[PDB]
Amino acid sequence: ATTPIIHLKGDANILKCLRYRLSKYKQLYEQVSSTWHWTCTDGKHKNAIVTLTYISTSQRDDFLNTVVIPNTVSVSTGYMTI
Amino acid sequence: ATTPIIHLKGDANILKCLRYRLSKYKQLYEQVSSTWHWTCTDGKHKNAIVTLTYISTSQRDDFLNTVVIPNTVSVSTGYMTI
Numbered sequence: 016a017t018t019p020i021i022h023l024k025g026d027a028n029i030l031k032c033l034r035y036r037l038s039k040y041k042q043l044y045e046q047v048s049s050t051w052h053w054t055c056t057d058g059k060h061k062n063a064i065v066t067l068t069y070i071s072t073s074q075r076d077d078f079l080n081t082v083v084i085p086n087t088v089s090v091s092t093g094y095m096t097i
Numbered sequence: 098a099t100t101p102i103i104h105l106k107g108d109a110n111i112l113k114c115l116r117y118r119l120s121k122y123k124q125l126y127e128q129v130s131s132t133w134h135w136t137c138t139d140g141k142h143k144n145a146i147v148t149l150t151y152i153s154t155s156q157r158d159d160f161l162n163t164v165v166i167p168n169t170v171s172v173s174t175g176y177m178t179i
Binding site: 017018020022034046047048049050051052053054055064066091092093094095096097 | 099100102104116128129130131132133134135136137146148173174175176177178179
């Protein structure tokens with residue numbers, strides 16, 4: 016069994032603002048992590064990442080299709096085994 | 098194409114110490130994130146998570162088999178599409 020997941024990558028403030036906007040779309044995702052970055056990276060702000068999880072791929076699809084994710088942020092998908 | 102990933106979940110200090118210990122095993126993983134938690138969670142410390150990425154599943158196997166991950170930490174696996 017797997018959990019669809021998503022990484023929003025980009026400037027830290029941009030992700031924080033995007034995260035506030037997700038409040039309008041809570042039905043479209045389950046959990047949003049706080050901002051994190053790779054320890055190897057000193058790259059302040061634009062090396063910030065946020066992970067979101069979903070009930071299903073269908074929910075993930077609806078999320079991507081509905082929520083406005085700016086061009087300044089990179090979206091990657093993946094899964095976690097339950 | 099996918100990146101094998103790992104979530105170490107547990108108390109925040111325990112993960113921080115584990116992360117210091119990984120310095121002995123840098124060849125066994127690529128990147129370790131800083132500590133993060135789910136925004137829904139107020140659960141201080143034990144709701145802390147750390148993500149690690151790997152060159153391959155083989156490297157992930159070697160990492161799990163070699164590094165001592167305490168029972169206080171939960172390990173889950175997953176992948177991210179490149």
